[PDB]
């Protein structure tokens, strides 16, 4: 019914914050991402995660990092959290020097690959675009891929928004909600609240009319087998 969240440690929360990109990529600097990196670090510290921030990593430094982390002994840890703050497209997030397949990163944490996390919740929080679609608004054995939750900031195929000053709509909401509810609600329920917050309260403002008055809806993908609570 509920994941055992009473191991000696809550676990690791790895935050990959990519702000500056190689000129060859044509990717604009991600202003506001620093507010996100900070808010996440304080939010998950209060939840008792051992937080590690990494800034501006190349596509190969992200993979080597995920690989070393998956080789860590996660025995005394209840869970694993990974937040990726960057530019992206459906199925890929950008390293500082180029695109990285999302399937390449998550695969190190598979049930059969990271044995000290088998049966434990593996959370991937992703702030990145998933395409260029615009929302205008209206009105015994266990599967190797079991126990994964992907909290995507947007719907498959759509743009994801960020405020150069306040940070991304999604990370702002995720953190607000967790500060308020992590001691009362089940994770999926907290996440549903994030969906309501970003969908109702945020609307893009832009001088470029094609990017003005746009809406966003995050997207929870759960392969979890039990309810998750950050309290005991």
């Amino acid at each position: 019914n509920s994941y055992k969240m009473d191991y000696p440690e809550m676990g690791l929360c790895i935050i990959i914050n990519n702000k500056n990109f190689h000129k060859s990529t044509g990717m604009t600097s991600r202003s506001g991402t620093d507010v996100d990196a900070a808010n996440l670090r304080e939010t998950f510290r209060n939840l008792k995660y051992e937080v590690r921030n990494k800034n501006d990593l190349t596509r190969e430094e992200i993979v080597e990092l995920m690989r070393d982390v998956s080789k860590e002994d996660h025995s005394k840890r209840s869970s694993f959290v990974c937040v990726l703050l960057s530019h992206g497209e459906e199925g890929i997030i950008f390293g500082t020097n180029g695109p990285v397949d999302l399937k390449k990163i998550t695969n190190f944490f598979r049930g059969d690959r990271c044995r000290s996390l088998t049966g434990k919740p593996k959370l991937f929080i992703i702030q990145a675009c998933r395409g260029t679609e615009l929302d205008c608004g209206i009105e015994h054995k266990i599967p190797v891929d079991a126990d994964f939750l992907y909290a995507y900031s947007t719907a498959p195929g759509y743009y994801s928004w960020r405020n150069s000053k306040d940070g991304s709509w999604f990370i702002q909401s995720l953190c607000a909600m967790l500060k308020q509810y992590a001691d009362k609600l089940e994770f999926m329920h907290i996440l549903t609240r994030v969906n309501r917050k970003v969908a109702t309260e945020f609307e893009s403002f832009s001088f470029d009319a094609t990017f003005h008055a746009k809406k966003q809806i995050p997207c929870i993908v759960s392969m979890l087998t039990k309810e998750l609570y950050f309290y005991h």
Binding site: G88, Q127, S153, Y159, R162, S164, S168, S206
Partner: peptide
């Protein structure tokens, strides 16, 4: 607001 900018897009990621």
């Amino acid at each position: 607001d900018v897009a990621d």
